[PDB]
Amino acid sequence: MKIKQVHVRASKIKLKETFTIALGTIESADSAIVEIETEEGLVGYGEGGPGIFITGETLAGTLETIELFGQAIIGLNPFNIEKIHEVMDKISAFAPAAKAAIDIACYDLMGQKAQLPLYQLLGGYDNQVITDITLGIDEPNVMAQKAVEKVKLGFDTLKIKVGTGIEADIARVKAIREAVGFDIKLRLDANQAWTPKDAVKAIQALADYQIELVEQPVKRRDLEGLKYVTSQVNTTIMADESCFDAQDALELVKKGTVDVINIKLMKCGGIHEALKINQICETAGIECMIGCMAEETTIGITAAAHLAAAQKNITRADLDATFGLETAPVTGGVSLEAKPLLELGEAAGLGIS
Ligand SMILES: CC[C@H](C)[C@H](N)C(=O)N[C@@H](Cc1ccc(O)cc1)C(=O)O
Numbered sequence: 001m002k003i004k005q006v007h008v009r010a011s012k013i014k015l016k017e018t019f020t021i022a023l024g025t026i027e028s029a030d031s032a033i034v035e036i037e038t039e040e041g042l043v044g045y046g047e048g049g050p051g052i053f054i055t056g057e058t059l060a061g062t063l064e065t066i067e068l069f070g071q072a073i074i075g076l077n078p079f080n081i082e083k084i085h086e087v088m089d090k091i092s093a094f095a096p097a098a099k100a101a102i103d104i105a106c107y108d109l110m111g112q113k114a115q116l117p118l119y120q121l122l123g124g125y126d127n128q129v130i131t132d133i134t135l136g137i138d139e140p141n142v143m144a145q146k147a148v149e150k151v152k153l154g155f156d157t158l159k160i161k162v163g164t165g166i167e168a169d170i171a172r173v174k175a176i177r178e179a180v181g182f183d184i185k186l187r188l189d190a191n192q193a194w195t196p197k198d199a200v201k202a203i204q205a206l207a208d209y210q211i212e213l214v215e216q217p218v219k220r221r222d223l224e225g226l227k228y229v230t231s232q233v234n235t236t237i238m239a240d241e242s243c244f245d246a247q248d249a250l251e252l253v254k255k256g257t258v259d260v261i262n263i264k265l266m267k268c269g270g271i272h273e274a275l276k277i278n279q280i281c282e283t284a285g286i287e288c289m290i291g292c293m294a295e296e297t298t299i300g301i302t303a304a305a306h307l308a309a310a311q312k313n314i315t316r317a318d319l320d321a322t323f324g325l326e327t328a329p330v331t332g333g334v335s336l337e338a339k340p341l342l343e344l345g346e347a348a349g350l351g352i353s
Pocket residue numbers: 019021026051054134189191240291292293294295318319320321
């Protein structure tokens with residue numbers, strides 16, 4: 001199998017509602033959709049959803065980088081994922097969205113050529129994944145009503161966004177808990193908003209509210225502060241922005257910084273690197289949660305779901321980016337439907353057309 005041409009295009013899909021997190025707001029999912037065409041005619045789908053307040057990547061930068069990657073990999077075999085990443089890493093020192101776009105399309109092609117659903121090539125542990133759904137920052141009563149609405153849709157796990165001030169954030173969590181009861185799992189995400197001290201204070205104040213875990217409570221560069229929180233509360237602490245790639249994972253494991261790690265294809269540059277992060281974590285006794293950017297869509301989410309289903313150590317999933325999209329840019333894959341169960345069919349590769 002040989003790559004004949006790499007096609008890329010901008011995709012801009014308005015969100016049904018603006019989403020607010022501690023780092024900013026998003027109202028449109030703008031990504032780069034890649035289609036790698038092979039000599040034999042098979043076409044693999046890839047996507048790069050750059051979140052500027054997460055990685056600094058922009059759609060224009062991502063598009064330009066993908067084009068450079070595209071020309072450099074013509075003639076290569078999609079199965080030679082080792083060389084494909086070698087080439088991209090030599091071209092750019094940092095562009096996870098662009099690298100993920102290429103990587104995802106290559107894996108899609110691998111599955112199609114082998115005539116197997118992607119999850120079978122990535123571990124084969126399962127063929128489905130259960131995802132939580134995220135509640136953007138808003139007034140306590142508002143988030144609470146939304147929570148009740150989501151639970152009605154069948155979600156048993158809600159990811160609560162917080163980060164404007166511990167006082168207000170605690171109020172948000174209490175309102176949500178009171179509204180939905182204790183049969184619902186609640187995980188919090190402060191998106192780097194709290195100081196180490198305030199994080200501990202807030203987590204302790206929510207002790208009787210049965211919090212499943214707390215994601216990135218402190219600034220990403222403050223690994224000492226992150227470890228401080230982890231070592232000061234029994235509550236599970238998850239690293240997100242503090243862990244982009246395998247090297248970061250290796251650093252957090254040596255330091256014992258967190259309890260769990262959030263893996264994003266858009267942070268590590270693809271499935272190839274995501275696998276490394278998970279393997280490092282599993283070896284260290286750290287479970288992983290597959291996540292996503294609000295900028296990605298069907299392709300990115302579908303690839304993430306196949307990886308999450310295939311690997312035993314990826315025990316949690318936050319793959320809800322398609323739920324806010326006004327439209328789907330492609331056919332097949334994970335639906336725009338807001339549902340907790342993401343079942344992967346038997347279609348080869350990503351099952352996208
Ligand atoms: C809006 C929630 C998204 C789909 C996901 N569950 C999420 O929370 N992702 C990031 C935060 C984020 C990234 C990019 C962006 O444009 C908005 C929000 C996370 O912290 O896990």
